[PDB]
Design a protein around this ligand. Structure first.
Ligand code: HEM
Ligand code: HEM
Ligand code: HEM
Ligand code: HEM
Ligand SMILES: [Cl-]
Ligand SMILES: [Cl-]
Ligand SMILES: [Cl-]
Ligand SMILES: [Cl-]
Ligand SMILES: [Fe+3]
Ligand SMILES: [Fe+3]
Ligand SMILES: [Fe+3]
Ligand SMILES: [Fe+3]
Ligand SMILES: [Fe+3]
Ligand SMILES: [Fe+3]
Ligand SMILES: [Fe+3]
Ligand SMILES: [Fe+3]
Ligand SMILES: [Fe+3]
Ligand SMILES: [Fe+3]
Ligand SMILES: [Fe+3]
Ligand SMILES: [Mg+2]
Ligand SMILES: [Mg+2]
Ligand SMILES: [Mg+2]
Ligand SMILES: [Mg+2]
Ligand SMILES: [Mg+2]
Ligand SMILES: [Mg+2]
Ligand SMILES: [Mg+2]
Ligand SMILES: [Mg+2]
Ligand SMILES: [Mg+2]
Ligand SMILES: [Mg+2]
Ligand SMILES: [Mg+2]
Ligand SMILES: [Mg+2]
Ligand SMILES: [Mg+2]
Ligand SMILES: [Mg+2]
Ligand SMILES: [Mg+2]
Ligand SMILES: [Mg+2]
Ligand SMILES: [Mg+2]
Ligand SMILES: [Mg+2]
Ligand SMILES: [Mg+2]
Ligand code: NA
Ligand code: NA
Ligand code: NA
Lengths: 161, 161, 161, 161, 161, 161, 161
């Protein structure tokens, strides 16, 4: 053969899956909370972000199985759940920085171990997460400048929508 | 100037072309044999795979000429030709593992010699070949579990098609 | 004039017609038997093959009349009728080998007697029959490898069709 | 069970098939002769009539197999082949009267033996053949009244068609 | 090289061209005469036949030039021009029998001299001319049976067309 | 049976395949070189010609397998690779003259051994190659008359295409 | 946090922006000069190339801001402006080789400093610039072979366009 992956690479893929499953759930819960609170526009964005992380998790599961490893979907990473709009954005941002650090370490490990296709998967995920970090930092900058109440209003729909 | 490539990089590109031309021909012959044997569905897939390797060969020829090297289309790599369905899949799989090993070595050589665009071409080919390896391993797993005769039936068309 | 054909050429055309009429009827009966037996997909193919031999018969009748000969539709060649799927394929194949031998001899006779248009007609029929031979040999090869029961299943439709 | 037909009913069905196969061939040859002679309109009608008798033969083969009998397509009834337009119509007409007499006897036999579905098939064929008899008698009446040469002209196409 | 044809093959191609140019002009004149005489339907057919011979002439010119010979369009074969409908058909038929004999001889010469592509061209022309012969023999047969005056009427249009 | 071909016919088919595979690769390389040199119009034509020879190779592979022989795709005929436009055309032309000679010999061998369907295949290939020869001789004639630099210009695209 | 980029990475991004802004302006001026000179086809290609470099500059500005650096659009790299068609192509080519060298150095610096997303941006730019280098080398090769005046004619439109 053989497609049998390096144990350490499969470990890194399973670490990424743990983080991705955490993000799926954190974003889904934040979507539902934001909706209940009346911030329907931000809630919609949060739901879309959860679905994007579902696609990441699927890519990771697929790669693990190709490498003849066993994907772990039994546990999810610790959730950070906000209690207002600013805390939701901050919680998501911290989660994104954690994933960024993980994928940077993982791409280096894959490179060193000669799994260039897995390295490329971590490079794709890294670019995606930096995109999300940039989005969140922008929202938090906007919220700081126009104030939390105006940011909340901006991200809520009128009663007839 | 100059676009003049490293001799060792052009060597690696010509090695890949030798392997790609072998794969084109092996898949084309396997398509025609599988068709004659009655496995029309698998024959169709094999024909598509040959055409995909034709595109790889074209990308390699193009890159060699950009680097001011001379592409060698005079010889093709040794063919592995099966005499039944399981042997056809095994023969293709061995050929794919050879190409995988070659492209892994070649991407490292391009990286070391500072040809990052050629390195990227080998990275693209590597991902493509791992995809094909995964397809073939799956077929061979299915064939093992349902039996060669059921796998053959699954991959044959009825007389009126 | 004249279009008056060589007697021996008309004889060869009438021999071909005798075989073609036999083939029409053998394939038509095999279509109806295969359908009664449940092999509806192979039955459909058999009906199509009968219709193709009807077109051959018509071309031969047309040529005989052009040569001012008299087409004989009073008798048909001996039918080989199978009692199961494998025997139907074998019976058809023997009939095709007979027609192949006849048309090879006939094209040589036409060439020798200077009737190049009749020779071309036998050449066209010969290529058609070699195609059929190829199809049938492939089916018999498939039947042998996957087994008669799987070949039967492959060539039967579900009850709601 | 059982669908096993009365031997005498299967005999009558096989007699009808013998006559139908004769009619197919007589009409097909008459089509080709009439065409060669220039009577393209009548030739077209004759070709259509041959195809109609092909459908009758198919209905008979189908019924024989349902009754668990063996259809005989090895022999065809004696052909009556005309040498001019009036003789072609007369030859066809005699063949139609023979089939009419046969189907009348056969429907009575099926009735007496309690095969009402086969009786109904002979009743359908009988009505069809009386239709054809009526068509032919009309043509022969027209030919008598306007003369054979005008009837021939009426049933020929101009050179550009 | 080279495509330089055998002189004798070019001679045979030029002989065919001579006959084809004669046929173009004979059919064109017969079209115009038949039209003047009132036989507009036969006239239309004659014009179509002239155009078909124009295509034959073009194929021959093309082949001669490929073989590096010089096509001769300076002279045309002796015209046979009829003075009534029956004579027009007879004149055309004699011209077709001449071309048939010429092309049979020419295909044999090409075969003997190893020019199989030119042989194939003569085979194609031969089949075309035998078709025309067939058409003309059929018209003359029809004319004989229904009489020249009815044949004329059949092939004339009413005054408002 | 049987479809088992004459060994000498299979040898001739394998010789044709060897030449066809050489032509595929020569035309493909010439396409890529001409494109690199700026002659994009001639390059497009060269790519089309390579694809046409791919179809020839496929027809030969198909016939070999029908005759129960083993197609050889392991080796390709010696490539003639030009270093400027005139040399590319001359190289292709020499390759076409080689294939023409081979197919003329092969059609004679097939005829002599009574394989008229394989003979017809060589006849089809022969006509195709004579067409190509014609095209190339015309280009070389044009290049000679208008000069290589104008021929090059004629066959290059402007920079915005 | 933090997205704060390495100072040396931001430096490399600002060096690339300086070069990109130079290229935008050089290609824009070359477009306008080529148009004034009558080489409308090449002028159109030059305008398209300027717009492509505008997109590169935008990607670089975006990345700098993501890294919390300050993009410098106050200065542009030294322009190389040609005074005839060959000099325009040469000037552009030299500019492309400079950018190629810069992006090769920059991707290595980003790799070493662990900014893999910035490294990927330099890899994308590098591939783009090698594409342009290949285009320009081809044009200069064509110009050399057919002559500057024919190359100019090829790349000019007629007066009515
Ligand atoms: C809290 C747990 C989850 C919730 C509440 C959730 C919710 C949803 C919903 C509602 C949809 C469909 C959107 C719609 O039609 O309205 C969806 C789609 C999807 N869930 N999902 C969860 C976890 C996961 C996990 C663990 C995976 C594993 C990979 C996953 C994979 C996907 C994918 C790939 C799609 C989109 C299908 C496609 O377009 O290809 N979801 N998730
Ligand atoms: C055994 C030798 C080969 C055979 C039998 C073969 C057969 C074919 C056929 C039949 C097609 C067209 C598919 C169709 O229209 O039915 C095709 C397409 C193609 N062959 N090919 C061979 C070798 C090569 C080689 C050496 C190259 C070099 C790069 C190549 C490049 C291509 C490309 C790029 C296409 C698709 C064109 C496009 O969609 O861009 N084939 N090959
Ligand atoms: C002299 C012998 C025969 C000749 C020359 C002949 C000729 C033809 C031709 C040429 C067609 C297709 C019409 C077209 O597409 O141009 C046809 C159709 C057909 N032949 N046929 C012959 C005998 C038979 C026999 C013995 C049967 C047995 C039942 C048969 C059954 C049919 C049927 C059912 C069709 C029409 C298919 C449909 O529409 O369902 N032909 N015959
Ligand atoms: C000499 C200076 C420049 C000139 C003369 C120029 C000219 C133009 C023109 C005329 C267009 C529109 C094309 C049309 O509609 O006809 C355009 C588009 C554009 N300029 N541009 C210059 C510098 C820049 C710079 C410094 C940037 C910075 C990134 C830039 C970014 C863009 C982009 C991104 C587009 C296309 C918009 C899109 O399709 O997304 N141009 N430039
Ligand atoms: Cl990399
Ligand atoms: Cl009743
Ligand atoms: Cl021949
Ligand atoms: Cl010029
Ligand atoms: Fe993610
Ligand atoms: Fe989901
Ligand atoms: Fe490949
Ligand atoms: Fe190909
Ligand atoms: Fe046949
Ligand atoms: Fe009937
Ligand atoms: Fe029929
Ligand atoms: Fe002619
Ligand atoms: Fe060829
Ligand atoms: Fe750029
Ligand atoms: Fe702009
Ligand atoms: Mg394994
Ligand atoms: Mg609430
Ligand atoms: Mg998959
Ligand atoms: Mg150089
Ligand atoms: Mg076979
Ligand atoms: Mg290119
Ligand atoms: Mg039954
Ligand atoms: Mg006809
Ligand atoms: Mg029973
Ligand atoms: Mg006749
Ligand atoms: Mg039924
Ligand atoms: Mg007058
Ligand atoms: Mg031509
Ligand atoms: Mg170049
Ligand atoms: Mg086939
Ligand atoms: Mg011969
Ligand atoms: Mg910060
Ligand atoms: Mg001016
Ligand atoms: Mg953005
Ligand atoms: Na407000
Ligand atoms: Na099964
Ligand atoms: Na009349």
């Amino acid at each position: 053969g053989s497609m049998k992956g390096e144990p350490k690479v499969i470990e890194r893929l399973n670490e990424a899956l743990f983080l991705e499953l955490g993000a799926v759930n954190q974003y889904w819960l934040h979507y539902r909370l934001l909706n209940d609170w009346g911030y329907t526009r931000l809630a919609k964005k949060e739901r879309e972000e959860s679905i994007e992380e579902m696609h990441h998790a699927d890519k990771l599961i697929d790669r693990i199985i190709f490498l003849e490893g066993f994907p772990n979907l039994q546990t999810v990473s610790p959730l950070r759940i906000g209690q207002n709009v600013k805390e939701v954005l901050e919680a998501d941002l911290k989660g994104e920085y954690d994933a960024r650090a993980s994928y940077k370490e993982s791409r280096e490990i894959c490179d060193k171990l000669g799994d260039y296709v897995s390295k490329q998967l971590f490079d794709e995920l890294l670019a995606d997460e930096e995109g999300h970090i940039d989005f969140l930092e922008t929202q938090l900058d906007l919220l700081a400048k126009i104030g939390g109440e105006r940011y909340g209003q901006l991200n809520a729909a009128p009663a007839d929508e």
